[PDB]
Ligand binder design. Structure first.
Ligand SMILES: [Zn+2]
Length: 348
């Protein structure tokens, strides 16, 4: 309870030598208490770059664009994704920077934040989301989202199971007013998120130690949905105003992400936000030893066919062999302490 008592979003500025060991820097920042906020920003060394130039990607194909339709009032909204026909980045850029769709003029980001919550049901934008891809170029060995070096890919090394987006990279091409809803990442994993180029991306975060209180509110407000799925927030369809969070006493923080910066979301950290204008972000999940407990306790999407669901079996068997017989019995009643850092942080 001592490291980051306010539970605010922190920012770290690793040195090139510190930057090179990914898993070890995550253990670092968690020792500093970054995980309590549920979200952290990491700025890479000025020397570092993931790709020489972004000039040559305008023929990149966005196969399944989404038009984001939003109904709702008083701070609470539901977001419907209409899929439109594929288009190339160029076609997207042009659409994004057109005046129908360009960022409104503004001074301070607070005003841009109010414009978002004021006009999010008007003029449904298009989000080139969930594009299978990397923009890293092959040789970049530090923080390559394509190959981050984590215990996560025991999923597909030892069990041979490709979960596209979870342990393969995703691209996001956004424009002004495009949202991602309140959501923890699948299986309550960590996620990483680099913004390659373009306008900023603004994030909201609820501390994992107060996540259950966010869940209670949403159940109250969408009773119909709560009835249908254990974890209806996993549908990534539900948007809640910061005004509503303040009103009902759910703690949270805001942070804006600039081009060239990394965001880390932590297990059972709820997040949401919006893009300021045309940009491109790259994202994948990943894990540490601390995630293993969250993995096990993860409530999942009952609604569906397709829930990303990961066999916990292989992880417990390797890193928790002294509880595997107990767990398999279903009598593993370990209680999670959201403030505790991952064990890898013992050294720091
Ligand atoms: Zn659901």
């Amino acid at each position: 309870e001592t490291l980051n008592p306010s539970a605010r979003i922190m920012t770290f500025y690793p040195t090139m030598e510190e930057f090179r060991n990914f898993s070890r820097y995550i253990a670092y920042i968690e020792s500093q208490g970054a995980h309590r906020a549920g979200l952290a920003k990491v700025v890479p060394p000025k020397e570092w770059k993931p790709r020489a130039s972004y000039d040559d990607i305008d023929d990149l194909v966005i196969p399944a664009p989404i038009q984001q339709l939003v109904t709702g009032q008083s701070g609470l909204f539901t977001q419907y994704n209409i899929q439109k026909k594929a288009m190339t980045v160029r076609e997207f850029r042009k659409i994004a920077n057109s005046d129908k769709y360009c960022t409104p003029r503004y001074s301070e980001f607070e005003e841009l934040e109010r414009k978002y919550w004021k006009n999010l049901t008007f003029n449904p934008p298009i989000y080139g989301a969930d594009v299978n891809g990397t923009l890293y170029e092959k040789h970049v060995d530090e923080w390559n989202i394509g190959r981050l070096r984590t215990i996560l890919d025991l999923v597909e090394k030892e069990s041979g199971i490709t979960i596209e987006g979870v342990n393969t990279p995703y691209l996001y091409f956004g424009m002004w007013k495009t949202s991602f809803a309140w959501h923890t990442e699948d299986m309550d994993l960590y996620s990483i998120n680099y913004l390659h180029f373009g306008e900023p991306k603004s994030w909201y975060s609820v501390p994992p130690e107060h996540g259950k209180r966010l869940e209670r509110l949403a159940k109250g407000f969408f009773p119909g949905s709560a009835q249908s799925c254990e974890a209806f927030l996993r549908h990534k369809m539900t948007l809640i105003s910061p005004l509503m969070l303040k009103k009902y006493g759910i703690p949270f923080d805001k942070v804006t992400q600039e081009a060239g910066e990394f965001m880390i979301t932590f297990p059972y950290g709820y997040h949401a936000g919006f893009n300021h204008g045309f940009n491109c972000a790259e994202s994948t999940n990943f894990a540490t030893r601390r995630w293993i407990e969250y993995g096990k306790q993860a409530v999942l999407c009952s609604c569906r066919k397709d829930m990303v669901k990961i066999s916990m079996d292989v992880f417990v068997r390797k890193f928790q062999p002294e509880r595997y017989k107990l767990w398999k019995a279903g009598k593993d009643n370990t209680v999670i302490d959201h403030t505790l850092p991952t064990p890898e942080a013992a050294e720091f």
